[PDB]
């Protein structure tokens, strides 16, 4: 039978035969009883234990879950089967949540599979995910929740269209993301600067003008990418970036010297020399810039 | 690079003159 084997092995040759069978039927799938075994295990586990029985024998169980996930990845068309596997993963997470069991390969594997499955699906709308992420980052907790919602946001953006932008929201969201130092920050920036444009350079410039240790290079690369003449868009922001009273200032200065049109530099030097009240621009940066422009 | 059987006689794909000549003279 099927349920008998799981109530036998978890609390050995039968496991080898079962795993070989799953491998052969997956070979049949890729060339062109997994549903039955998944239904049998779901019925066994919903019914009254077994999860802690196989917790000490994760070496026999974890490859089976990998095989089932490979089946799901091979063919996503068979919904219901995939959904039942997702429910089984949630049930495994919920039942195993007793903290006394300590860490394990099975626990982390189920967590990885659940995170992947949540990543696979798409969210309904960009705005709802953005508001959820802003709230989650504002609460300064639940890093896995923050990871899940940025995954949903990236999924909807890479499978979406021109939605509302709400610049102050995006500035605060990205400030929170760099503060918590997300791993999906570059992916998110790529996702929502590829489209959904209505002033990305203003967002990047405002973020940089605001401390920003590791992610400053990413933003610097970004406004080098989308602001070629550097001070072309919103000139006052870039003027106070390049000349004011920072770390990446020499890099941006080099870009502005060797990358901008001659009218741009002419207007810049007229600005630097036409301020009759300011003392706002740095003397050092302005003088080095003038010397660089001459030479 | 990586090898399963460290001491394997079939590893050498391009062989010495004796085995090359014997191979060509028998691979038919």
């Amino acid at each position: 039978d099927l349920a008998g084997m799981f109530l036998q092995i978890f609390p050995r040759p039968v496991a080898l035969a079962l795993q070989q069978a799953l491998g052969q039927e997956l070979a049949r799938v890729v060339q062109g009883i997994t549903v039955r075994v998944l239904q049998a295990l779901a019925t066994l586990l919903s019914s009254p234990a077994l999860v802690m029985s196989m917790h000490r024998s994760h070496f026999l169980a974890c490859p089976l879950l990998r095989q089932l996930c490979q089946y799901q990845r091979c063919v996503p068309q068979d919904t219901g089967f995939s959904s039942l596997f997702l429910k089984v993963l949630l049930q495994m997470l919920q039942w195993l949540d007793s903290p006394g069991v300590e860490g394990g390969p099975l626990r982390a594997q189920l967590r990885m599979l659940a995170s992947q499955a949540s990543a696979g699906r798409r969210l309904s709308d960009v705005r709802g995910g953005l508001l959820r992420l802003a709230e989650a980052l504002a609460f300064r907790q639940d890093l896995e929740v923050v990871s899940s919602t940025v995954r949903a946001v990236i999924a909807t953006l890479r499978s979406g269209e021109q939605c509302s932008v709400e610049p102050d929201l995006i500035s605060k969201v990205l400030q929170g993301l760099i503060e918590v130092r997300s791993p999906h920050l570059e992916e998110l920036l790529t996702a929502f600067f590829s489209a959904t444009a209505d002033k990305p350079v203003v967002v990047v410039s405002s973020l940089l003008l605001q401390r920003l240790g590791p992610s400053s290079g990413l933003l610097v690369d970004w406004l080098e990418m989308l602001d070629p003449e550097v001070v072309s868009s919103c000139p006052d922001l870039q003027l106070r970036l390049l000349f004011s009273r920072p770390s990446f200032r020499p890099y941006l200065l080099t870009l502005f010297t060797h990358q901008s049109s001659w009218p741009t530099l002419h207007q810049c030097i007229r600005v630097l020399l036409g301020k009759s009240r300011e003392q706002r621009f740095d003397p050092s940066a302005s003088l080095d810039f003038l010397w660089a422009c001459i030479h | 690079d990586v090898s399963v059987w460290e001491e394997n006689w079939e590893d050498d794909i391009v062989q010495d003159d004796f085995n090359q000549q014997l191979r060509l003279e028998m691979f038919r």
Binding site: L22, P183, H184, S215, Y251, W291 | -
Partner: protein, 503 residues
């Protein structure tokens, strides 16, 4: 002869039409290979330097190609001063391409005439020139001379620092200018000053290209100057965890792999713990694959012994051993195999069977698709099988049993590789002959109609493992083997190799 050939080449040189001159000049290195006689080499290079001095820039370019190809024969130059003196004269030409070819010439000759101070001065003056080709040639020559001269390296490090920190220097020139610093491994204070400069570079120029170039050349410099290796390792780990860019993380992985390949013993427990934390934390499977490759490289060496029961490395390797991706699983189970075969603590006894069933899963995963990546992962797993059966011989019965149960269903290439693995295991312990011999024999029957390409090699490997399994005489079995050969092989080379293994 030697003289005859040299005379012919000189005749081609004087020809005055550019085609024959270029033909002769590029014909020179073949002459050097023909007759490596130092009198001929010296006279020939003197003629080459003379045509270099007076002759258009394309001829000089051909001469530069010759000097780059004939770098070894430069050691056999006696009249070095005259040769360089007439090469060096064209640095005063107002033509920047001629100056560029001259700077590249001096760069090619940095091995034989370092510490020629006028040449150093020409590199230094040409560095801040206006023509772009002259500046690049000066950069290349500076790289060569810094690799050769300590005096030049210490003299030029300050110029390079003020050139990067200079603002008229564009970004691409800065990028070409940074990796001169990998040649500052002549001195301890020199290396320390260069390290300080590189730190200033990454903080003040945080672009992806420039941080990549700077932190990669800093890695090479710390690799050569061994004193800075631990702080380089901790800088790379810090950048791997902190810097969000995938290109920066990929570089951190690749050059940490370089460091772990050359000085694994200098890796500390803190570094391995930090790398394991990074691997557990990352969501990107390519990054996880890369730093797990680094972990497997470390675990192959003594660094695991320095690392030491349960820890983040063990949790990592158990977690990643059953990964969906095949490469992460292969590397994680290699890490498990190395830890298992290294130590003999009492907690490891639970770890070995985890490793064994991980290898089992890798066999079930990688034995069907026949992709080249599948072949790579299968080779990794099978080499691990061989390793932990040789190193932990009490665990070989289960290894061979899963190999037998899987040999029926695997594809032909996987069958070849598993037969090689099984042959190694059987050669290393003799107590399993008749049984497994019968199973491989009943497998041998169905080999006559497998495929057309891998059938021969599969037959060779299967007969080989049959012979290793056997330790006695067989008559009806030999009849079956011979009948199979006559029926399906009809080649002989397979029969000859099988007979070789039988002998």
């Amino acid at each position: 002869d030697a003289n005859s050939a040299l005379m012919e080449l000189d005749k081609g040189l004087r020809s005055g039409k550019l085609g024959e001159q270029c033909e002769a000049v590029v014909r020179f290195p073949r002459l050097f290979q023909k007759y490596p006689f130092p009198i001929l080499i010296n006279s020939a290079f003197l003629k080459l330097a003379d045509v270099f001095r007076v002759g258009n820039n394309f001829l000089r370019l051909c001469v530069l190609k010759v000097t780059q190809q004939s770098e070894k024969h430069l050691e056999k130059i006696l009249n070095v001063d005259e040769f360089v003196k007439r090469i060096f004269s064209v640095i005063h030409s107002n033509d920047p391409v001629a100056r560029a070819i001259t700077l590249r010439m001096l760069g090619s000759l940095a091995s034989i005439i370092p510490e020629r101070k006028n040449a150093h001065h020409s590199i230094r003056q040409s560095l801040d020139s206006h023509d772009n080709v002259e500046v690049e040639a000066a950069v290349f020559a500076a790289a060569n001379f810094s690799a050769q001269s300590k005096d030049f390296a210490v003299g030029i490090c300050n110029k390079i620092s003020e050139m990067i920190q200079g603002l008229a220097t564009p970004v691409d020139l800065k990028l070409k200018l940074i990796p001169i610093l990998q040649h500052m491994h002549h001195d301890a204070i020199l290396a320390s000053s260069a390290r300080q400069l590189l730190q200033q570079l990454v903080t003040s120029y945080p672009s992806t290209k420039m941080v990549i170039v700077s932190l990669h050349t800093f890695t090479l410099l710390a690799a050569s100057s061994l004193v800075d290796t631990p702080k380089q390792i901790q800088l790379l780990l810090q950048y791997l965890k902190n810097d969000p860019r995938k290109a920066v993380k990929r570089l951190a992985i690749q050059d940490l792999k370089l460091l772990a390949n050359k000085t694994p013993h200098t890796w500390s427990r803190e570094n391995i713990q930090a790398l394991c934390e990074c691997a557990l934390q990352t969501p990107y499977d390519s990054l996880k694959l890369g730093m797990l490759s680094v972990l497997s490289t470390l675990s192959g060496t003594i660094a695991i012994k320095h690392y030491f029961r349960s820890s983040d490395l063990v949790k990592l390797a158990q977690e990643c051993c059953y990964h969906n991706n095949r490469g992460i699983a292969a590397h994680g189970v290699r890490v498990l195999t190395n830890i298992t075969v290294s130590c003999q603590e009492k907690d490891l006894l639970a770890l070995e069977q985890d490793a064994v069933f991980g290898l089992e899963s890798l066999l079930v995963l990688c034995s069907q698709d026949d992709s080249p990546g599948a072949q790579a992962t299968l080779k990794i797993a099978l080499n691990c099988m061989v390793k932990l059966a040789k190193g932990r011989p009490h665990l070989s019965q289960s290894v061979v049993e899963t190999l037998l149960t899987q040999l029926h269903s695997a594809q032909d290439a996987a069958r070849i590789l598993m037969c090689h693995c099984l042959a190694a295991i059987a050669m290393q312990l003799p107590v399993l002959g008749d049984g497994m011999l019968g199973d491989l024999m009943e497998l041998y029957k169905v080999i006559g109609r497998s495929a057309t390409d891998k059938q021969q090699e599969l037959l060779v490997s299967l007969a080989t493992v049959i012979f290793v399994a056997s330790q006695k005489a067989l008559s009806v079995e030999s009849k079956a083997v011979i009948k199979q050969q006559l029926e399906s092989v009809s080649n002989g080379w397979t029969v000859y190799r099988i007979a070789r293994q039988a002998s």
